[PDB]
Amino acid sequence: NARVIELIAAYRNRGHLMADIDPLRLDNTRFRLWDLDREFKKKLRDILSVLRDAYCRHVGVEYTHILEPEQQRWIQERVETKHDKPTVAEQKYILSKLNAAEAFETFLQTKYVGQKRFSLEGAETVIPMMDAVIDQCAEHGLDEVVIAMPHRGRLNVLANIVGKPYSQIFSEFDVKYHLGATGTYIQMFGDNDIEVSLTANPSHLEAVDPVLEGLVRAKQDLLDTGRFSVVPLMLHGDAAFAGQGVVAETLNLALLRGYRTGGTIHIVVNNQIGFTTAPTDSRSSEYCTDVAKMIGAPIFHVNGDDPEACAWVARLAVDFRQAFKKDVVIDMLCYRRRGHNEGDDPSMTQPYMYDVIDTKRGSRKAYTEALIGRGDISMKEAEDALRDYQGQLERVFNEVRELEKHLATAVDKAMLQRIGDAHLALPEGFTVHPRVRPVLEKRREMAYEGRIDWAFAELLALGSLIAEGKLVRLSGQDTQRGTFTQRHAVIVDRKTGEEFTPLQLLATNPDGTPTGGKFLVYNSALSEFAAVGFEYGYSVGNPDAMVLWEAQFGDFVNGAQSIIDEFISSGEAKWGQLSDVVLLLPHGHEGQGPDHTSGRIERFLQLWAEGSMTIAMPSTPANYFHLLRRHGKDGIQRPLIVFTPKSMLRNKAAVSDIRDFTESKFRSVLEEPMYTDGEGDRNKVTRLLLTSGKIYYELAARKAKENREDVAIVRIEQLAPLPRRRLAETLDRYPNVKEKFWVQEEPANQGAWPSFGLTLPEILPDHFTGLKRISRRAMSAPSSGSSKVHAVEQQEILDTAFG
Amino acid sequence: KNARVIELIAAYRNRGHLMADIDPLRLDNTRFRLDREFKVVQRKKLRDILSVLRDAYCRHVGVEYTHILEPEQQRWIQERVETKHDKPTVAEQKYILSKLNAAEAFETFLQTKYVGQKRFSLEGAETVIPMMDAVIDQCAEHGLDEVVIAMPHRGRLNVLANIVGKPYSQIFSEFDVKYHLGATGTYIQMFGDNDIEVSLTANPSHLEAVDPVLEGLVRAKQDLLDTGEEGSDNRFSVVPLMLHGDAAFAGQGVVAETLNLALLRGYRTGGTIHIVVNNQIGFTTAPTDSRSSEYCTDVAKMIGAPIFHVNGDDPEACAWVARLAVDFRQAFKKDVVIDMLCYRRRGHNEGDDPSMTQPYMYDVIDTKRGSRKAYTEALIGRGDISMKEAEDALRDYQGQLERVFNEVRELEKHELATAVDKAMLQRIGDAHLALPEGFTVHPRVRPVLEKRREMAYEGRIDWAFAELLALGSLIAEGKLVRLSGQDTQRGTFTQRHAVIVDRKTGEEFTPLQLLATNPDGTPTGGKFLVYNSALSEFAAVGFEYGYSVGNPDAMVLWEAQFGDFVNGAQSIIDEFISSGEAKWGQLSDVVLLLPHGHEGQGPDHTSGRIERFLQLWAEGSMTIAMPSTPANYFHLLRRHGKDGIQRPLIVFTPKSMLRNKAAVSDIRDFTESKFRSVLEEPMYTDGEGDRNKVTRLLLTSGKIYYELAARKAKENREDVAIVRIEQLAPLPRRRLAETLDRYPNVKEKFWVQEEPANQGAWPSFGLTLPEILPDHFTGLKRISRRAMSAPSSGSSKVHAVEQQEILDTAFG
Ligand SMILES: Cc1ncc(C[n+]2c([C@H](C)O)sc(CCOP(=O)(O)OP(=O)(O)O)c2C)c(N)n1
Ligand SMILES: Cc1ncc(C[n+]2c([C@H](C)O)sc(CCOP(=O)(O)OP(=O)(O)O)c2C)c(N)n1
Ligand SMILES: [Ca+2]
Ligand SMILES: [Ca+2]
Ligand SMILES: [Mg+2]
Ligand SMILES: [Mg+2]
């Protein structure tokens, strides 16, 4: 009886190593008491039969790694029971899905050339599997299923899952393998319907994974679900799932209050190959899905030649996700019938795999034959299924044949005061930390008396948008408090730890009615790639939301370079996909080293093309306030890249008056206040210094010290698109200028000079011919490691500018 | 009856760690909420079985091992953890105490002497010093050669003084970059007669980015010692010791990517010892906002690594677990993870009052005495040391505190031809046909082998063979050549065949490996290491960079599938490759091969982003090239391997140009030439072309030369000359000036490129060329694709119209 308990556990824990999951059976070595009629606390023979049928057939179940005992028991109870065999109607429906999938693959490989790399041949069982996921989500009465996938079988998914007509898919035939889509799934045997959408993606495998999560979360927030009535269905390749780090980063978001989507259904199209590379060179684990153990997700390894087991596992996966709001991974073992592309004979690199693959008949033929052998379908019914295949193959050829034949951002002072007062409108019994208390009181003072600092200006911009009814999502590393202890968007009760969000009071009107707005502010995980991916995705999911991601320091945003390059900077031109995502990048030379100095302005300026992004480096709190309000209210979906301050947050010269918020607008170009408001004479100016950011204050302090009336400092607040007209009109007001200099803190090969030094004399030749540069010398790093070297270099720039 | 006992044993083994007293702060208040003999074959009283299970799984060590698929590994851990362990000797306890004394004294000095050092404080986590000491001592006990450490900034200088053994005079000299520099030392056993080398690798502030770099460096050192995967012995005598933070370990994707390399034939280092300094905080962020798993180390389950969660206030358990981790790694050549639960005594940096965001954690922390005082007190309670001995431990603490204050005070008072012979070419050609007895060549690979023998003897050498001629000749000269990347053995474009596969057995054959043996039969000292990489960019590039640091005499090449995917490794490019030399004095000779070219395959199969590498470049940091001929690529690789200078090389390599019949080279280009940074048209250097007829000069780089040359030939345009810039960085100023001076009647000059106006070489050349050579490039104009937000159009129809528009503009 003790040997039985240890045997039951052996099947539950390790039974999946004996499971018949590989349709190619490449591993020969894989499968290599007599008192069975004795009753145990059920007869041993009946215990072993249940254990073999549940754990050693076409499904390999991995679940004993799960720490929650209720989750282990849930799987156990559903897997260790005598399952009701599918009805002939359900079997015929699965067969019709295989018929449609294989007829689409036959057409693709016959009608067009160069389509072999998109081939789903050897993996057509993923179509009835995805169909069962979506149908089971419809059965749960859910609202939408959003899909992210690589290029393999994407057009088959468009036709047989999303339900896109052939006329739309094969219109002016590629970019079609990277575009988004929307459709409606209607249940076959049920009375429910569900929305099905496919998100756009680059060729960069797995990069879309966090983008899907953000998009689904934005949709869930709009529907007020999380319920979690919007389901992410994420498809993968076996080599990419095990090798791409973004997979682990996206899994790590699955249960976070700021990023959870109530569980993702993962489908790995495990064709046991990655171009020419064997699994043994692609991963250090038994399974390509072993990374999912990181969050204790249940994993089901299923034989891709058994579409009934695949459909059953898909439905069980949806039920688990609904019950525990956690990720489920389906590892579908299949094969890639043809080579990776046109110039590939896969027996050059994988002779053994492809000698076995050459003897394989399709999943459709195998399933049709297995249904005859089992006596589930008659010869007429098998013949009718073959008619259905031919008819489906004819329809796509025929339908395609017919296709071929044919605003003010200023707020009222009462708005500033309301946001100010909100910082003191504390809940009953709330204990503020003694060091947070002066920050709340100073904000009430600033709101009524002026000298508004950068940190408060940001909250005035965000707070006024929430008051106007906008959803504001703000996140990043330690973003609630702020890296530089300046934000305090969330304050923590000194005795209970209860969080209080002052800006959330602006979601309610003075009369007590909701504005429709909301403030969602989170501390992110220590991720850049997945967090930026998520935020980009969130802005796509809800175009009406104000979405801001904040880097700890701009220097760490290179960890999210694939998102910047493949989605943010180029998604609009490539896919017509629009994003209003904001990236806040703390930037500035202060002597803290090459990883706490630059958000790499030069790289964002290099990526920029007409109307793709807005790139700014504001120097005043009011200009930042108007930049965020213009972004949220301009009705245009364009990413905004902001180079934000660090020490300039506390510079007492970098403060703004209430009138700058109430009676002004965003200024792309800024002159010195002595010329616009003071008694300064523009006609005395012979040298013009053009700059951006905090170095203005150091240049202005030096000018004041030596009383240099012959020098003027002009700031370019909007770096991209270049404010050509505002720039020209500003410089025209200084007629006696004999020399012009672009002054920057960044090395010569960095900052704005590489692009401005080439663009400014071309766009404005009567103004910038002969433009010279004052900067740090060109460097292989964003700065020196020494704060002593930094300090000498900073002084050398100021001395050169006034020499 | 005994079924409730078998179920109890399994429950403690599987889930005991969930009840183990691992948190020294005890923040979770919900966490912790007989005399009959049983068969276990041995007969033990139920009380004795339960006491063994409680001590093993529910004390100060939480053991996670039942997830391991190998039964022998599960049994090994079980046998060592479920035994009545011999308590450490008073001498061993006093030695652990002396390590805590030294660690805490270093920390107290660091906060008192200098300002702005709070962010690198190890207070609340000093137990990592006797833990690291036990790792290194246990590696010395196994007679290993070296322990190579990678870590973030927290406790770095303490590790330098108390682990690496660097003197204070060296540590606080010209006192920051010191928290990022590499170091080397010798660890000498206290209680033994063994010694071991201890080194610390350089790293940026980018947490976890150094993880694959450490692996690459260790692997290079193992290959040099002929230990491990490419060695005669299975000792893997160089041990990676990788330190982490709890928030970074769970959130950074490079962790999973590096763990995925642990057992790969091309990347394994025989197991890494991981130490997570789990201070249960990440700046102001709580674990519940940093991970979706019970533990920060749950990612390590991915490779079935054993995980030990240990209480940082128990340095005995920490030392014991460290020694067990080294023994497991030696027995199974697999990763071990130590999750050391501790706390961060101070705020994250100066000014930070941590009770603002974590009031509860920091009210508990304020009541906590140090790990040192805790261990001194716990030894008194156990009766292991007397009151006098406890007072001497406090005097050893004061003496250590005085020594560092005094030592630093005293410090302040005092302060080649690349051409080969035709016989070399022929030998590499013949090697492609020198097949092992019984080997079956796939019928489609056989002509490639026969064509390479014909190329070596008769010329018209293509790009793919030229690469193997450079690599093969270096191996023949005694150089180690490491080449890897996605499908690099065969080649993405089916052009390489560095490894060929037996049609019947699947056995691999490497033709270039025959060149590691001289014609007499003696070894050359060279070797060819060629691998297919995992589907990773960040970890694979990190690894290859690290490998070139570990063996500066090796030729290390990493090949991107397409240059477009190298942005996945941007942190390595930015933080190590382009800038490691200027920041840390750390040198790398790593080569990046990036398939590049506009051919209508879309924005992710077109560009390796030349403009970004050119933007990163600064005098003497990297070499950036886009060769147009096979012989020039051959001489570029040979120059790089033989220059005696450690500097990264970035090569933009071809795709369709691999099979362009005009892009072939003669034997004389390999045997009687050198690398040419600037190339003229052969009609001027070898033909009957007249340079004086030229009025328009087109400056270009790469495959567009052939299209421009074909158009010139078609219209017989004697008035137009095409000059190629093969070396993009550093700009070949002298060669470029001398070349253009040979065309006196030139009235207009154009930089012609395939890439959009905001991409390619134009953003830097358009600004630098008129400045570096004003008498030659004043008035230089651009012919290119329009500026774009992506590297190209998604349409091959649009690409084709744009390609023709460039050629027509160049000859209009
Ligand atoms: C991040 C990134 N790095 C590399 C590539 C290049 N790349 C591809 C092409 C050439 O673009 S396909 C491919 C192998 C895919 O292996 P898998 O996951 O087993 O799938 P499959 O069997 O369904 O194909 C790679 C490696 C990429 N797309 N993205
Ligand atoms: C990749 C990347 N993204 C962000 C940062 C910024 N950054 C740091 C500074 C300000 O640069 S420290 C830090 C928190 C570290 O948390 P941990 O791992 O729990 O450790 P600890 O408790 O031992 O400190 C972060 C998040 C970084 N360095 N690298
Ligand atoms: Ca907008
Ligand atoms: Ca070199
Ligand atoms: Mg695959
Ligand atoms: Mg930490």
- H, E, C per residue of A729-755: HHHCCCCCCCEEEEEEEEECCCCCHHH
* Ligand 1 atom closest to A151 (CA): 23
CB atoms within 10 A of CB A449: 11
* Cβ(A659)–Cβ(A676) below 8 Å: no
* Out of B257, B263, B506, closest to residue A245 by CB: B257
CA A479 – ligand 3 centroid, Å:
22
DSSP label of A272: S
Report the nearest atom of ligand 2 relative to the CA of B119.
24
Contacts of B14 in chain A (CB under 8 A): 64
- Cα(B767)–Cα(B782) distance, rounded to whole angstroms? 11
**Taking CB atoms and an 8 Å cut-off, how many pairs form between chains A and B?**
343
Contacts of A446 (CB under 8 A, 6+ apart): A420, A452, A453, A456
Give the minimum alpha-carbon distance from B349 to chain A in angstroms, rounded to a whole number. 10
Cβ–Cβ below 8 Å for B501 and A351: yes
Instruction: List the beta strands (DSSP E) in B234-288.
Output: 238-245, 273-278
Comparing CA positions, the residue from A174, A287, A104, A302 lying closest to residue A575 is A174
A546-550 sheet: strands from edge to edge: A518-523, A471-476, A546-550, A582-586, A640-644, A614-616, A718-720
CB B500 within 8 A of CB B509: yes
Q: How remote is the C-alpha of B303 from its chain's centroid?
A: 19
Q: What angle do CA B200, B203, B206 make, to 5 degrees?
A: 140
CA–CA distance, A235 with A711 (Å, rounded to integer):
61
CB contact under 8 Å between B604 and A254, yes or no, is no
Picking from B597, B596, B632, the residue whose alpha carbon sits closest to that of residue B732 is B632
- Nearest alpha-carbon partner for B782 in B751, B747, B746, B810: B751
Give the separation between CA A579 and CA A58, rounded to whole angstroms: 43
- What's the resolution in A? 2.3
Shortest CB distance from B359 goes to which of A480, A492, A781? A492
CB-CB neighbors (< 8 A) of B495 in chain A: none
Residues facing residue A61 across a β-bridge: A300
Q: Per-residue b/e over B70-93, b at no fewer than 16 CB within 10 Å? A: eeebbebbeeebbeeeeeeeeeeb
How far is the alpha carbon of B584 from chain A, nearest alpha carbon, in Å? 9
Q: Whose CA is nearest to atom 12 of ligand 1?
A: A275
Atom of ligand 2 nearest to the CA of B279: 22
Fold of B413-596+623-676: Rossmann fold (3.40.50)
CA distance readout (Å), B401 to B124, B370, B410 = 18, 15, 15
Domains A58-404 and A588-613+668-803 share a fold: yes
User: Closest ligand 2 atom to the C-alpha of A483?
Assistant: 10
Give, as one character, the DSSP assignment of residue A125: T
Is the shortest distance between the CB of A554 and ligand 2 below 6 Å? no
Residues with CB under 6 A from ligand 1: A 152, 203-205, 237-240, 244, 269, 271, 273-275, 336; B 486, 535, 561, 565, 568
Query: In this structure, which CATH number among 3.40.50.9100, 1.10.287.1150, 1.10.287.70, 3.30.110.30 belongs to the domain A1-57?
Result: 1.10.287.1150
User: Alpha-carbon distance A574 to B603, whole Å?
Assistant: 8
CA separation for the pair A666, A336 (Å, rounded) = 56
Q: What is the number of the ligand 1 atom nearest to the C-alpha of A275? A: 14
Cα distance between the two ends of chain B: 96
Given 3.90.1300.10, 3.90.580.10, 3.40.50.2000, 3.40.50.11610, which CATH number is that of B597-622+677-812? 3.40.50.11610
State which CATH number among 3.80.30.20, 3.30.300.30, 2.30.30.30, 3.40.50.11610 fits the domain covering A588-613+668-803.
Answer: 3.40.50.11610
Alpha carbon distance A535, A532 (integer Å)? 5
Which ligand approaches the C-alpha of residue A628 most closely?
Answer: 3
Report how far residue A100's alpha carbon sits from residue A118's, in angstroms, rounded to the nearest whole number. 16
How far, in Å, is the centroid of ligand 5 from the Cα of A362?
Answer: 18
How far does the centroid of ligand 6 lie from the alpha carbon of residue B275, in Å?
Answer: 12
Chain breaks in chain B (C to N over 2.5 A) after: 33, 40, 175, 415
- CB within 8 Å of B429: residues ≥ 6 apart: B452, B453, B454, B455, B456, B457
Helix (H, G, I), strand (E, B) or coil at B241: strand
Q: Are A617 and A692 in contact (CB under 8 A)?
A: yes
Q: Report how far ligand 5's centroid is from the alpha carbon of B635 (Å).
A: 37
Cα–Cα distance measured from residue A712 to residue B691, given in angstroms and rounded to the nearest whole number:
51
User: Could you tell me the fold of the domain covering A58-404?
Assistant: Rossmann fold (3.40.50)
Tell me if A178 is assigned to a ligand binding site.
Answer: yes
Q: Which residues contact B587 (CB under 8 A, 6 or more apart)?
A: B549, B552, B580, B581, B646, B647
**Which residues from chain A sit within 8 angstroms of residue B10, using beta carbons?**
9
- Nearest-CA residue for atom 6 of ligand 1: B561
Cα separation, B577 vs B595, in Å, equals 19
Q: Measured from the CB, is residue B354 less than 6 Å from ligand 2?
A: no
Residues of A in contact with B20 (CB under 8 A): none
Can you read off the two tokens belonging to residue B554?
């090796």
Whether the CB of B284 sits within 6 Å of ligand 2: no
Best residue among A552, A590, A596, A598 to mutate for probing ligand 2, ranked by most atoms within 8 Å of CB: A552
Of A290, A755, A779, the CB nearest to B582: A779
Write out the H or E segment, with its range, that includes residue B304: none
Helix, strand, coil % in chain B, rounded to nearest 5: 45, 15, 40
| Torsion, Cα of A609, B607, A273, B229 (10° steps) | -120
Structure token pair of residue A402: 């017919």
CB contact under 8 A, A290 and B301: yes
- Alpha helices, H only, A450-510: 454-467
Indicate the DSSP class of residue B285: B
- How many whole angstroms separate alpha carbon B65 and alpha carbon B74? 6
Asked if A750 lies within 8 A of B15 by C-beta distance, the reply is no
**Exposure of B632 in the CB half-sphere (CA atoms within 13 A):** 21
Helix, strand, coil percentages, rounded to 5, for chain A? 45, 15, 40
Question: Alpha-carbon distance B775 to B333, whole Å?
Answer: 63
Q: Which of B205, B261, B359 lies at the smallest CB-CB distance from A595?
A: B205
CA A52 – CA A55 distance, rounded (Å): 5
B60-412, what's its fold? Rossmann fold (3.40.50)
Residue B412, judged by CB atoms within 10 A of its CB (0-12, 13-18, 19+), counts as exposed
Q: Mind telling me how many Å the CA of B734 is from chain A's nearest CA?
A: 21
Q: Which residue has the tokens 């999303």?
A: A162
**Ligand 2 binding pocket includes B246 (Cβ within 6 Å):** yes
For chain A, the C-alpha Rg in angstroms (whole number) is 31
Interchain proximity A175–B575, CB inside 8 Å: no
Measured distance CA(B524)–CA(B509) in Å, rounded: 19
Secondary structure (DSSP) of A390-416: HHHHHHHHHHHHHHHH-------HHHH
Question: Residue ranges per domain, chain B?
Answer: 1-59, 60-412, 413-596+623-676, 597-622+677-812
Residues in B closer than 8 angstroms to A240, CB to CB, are 535
Distance, in Å, from the CA atom of A186 to the CA atom of A196, rounded to the nearest integer, reads 10
* CA-closest candidate to residue B618, choices A597, A786, A749: A749
β-sheet bridge partners, residue B723: B699
Report the candidate in A541, A28, A620, A55 with the shortest Cα–Cα distance to residue A309: A55
Among B357, B448, B500, B616, pick the best mutation site for testing chain A contact (most A Cβ within 10 A): B357
* CATH class of domain segment(s) B1-59: mainly alpha
Query: Which are the contacts of A610, defined by CB distance < 8 A and separation ≥ 6?
Result: A721, B787
Q: Is residue A340 packed enough to be buried (19+ CB in 10 Å), middle (13-18) or exposed (0-12)?
A: buried
Three-class secondary structure of residue B315 per DSSP: helix
Asked if residue A606 lies in contact with residue A754, where contact means CB atoms within 8 angstroms, the answer is yes
Name every chain A residue with its beta carbon within 8 A of the beta carbon of B15: 67
B294 C-alpha vs ligand 6 centroid, how far in Å? Answer: 15
What class, spelled out in words, does domain A405-587+614-667 have in CATH? alpha beta
Contacts of A417 (CB under 8 A, 6+ apart): A447, A448
* Burial tier of A605 (Cβ tally within 10 Å: 0-12, 13-18, 19+): buried
Q: Pick the ligand that lies closest to the CA of residue A530.
A: 2
Indicate whether residue B344 lines ligand 2 (CB < 6 A).
Answer: yes
* A596 marked as binding residue: yes
Tokens representing B416 are: 């080649």
Binding residues of B for acetyl-CoA, by number, are 623, 639, 674, 677, 727, 734-735
In a 3-state reduction of DSSP, which class is residue B188? strand
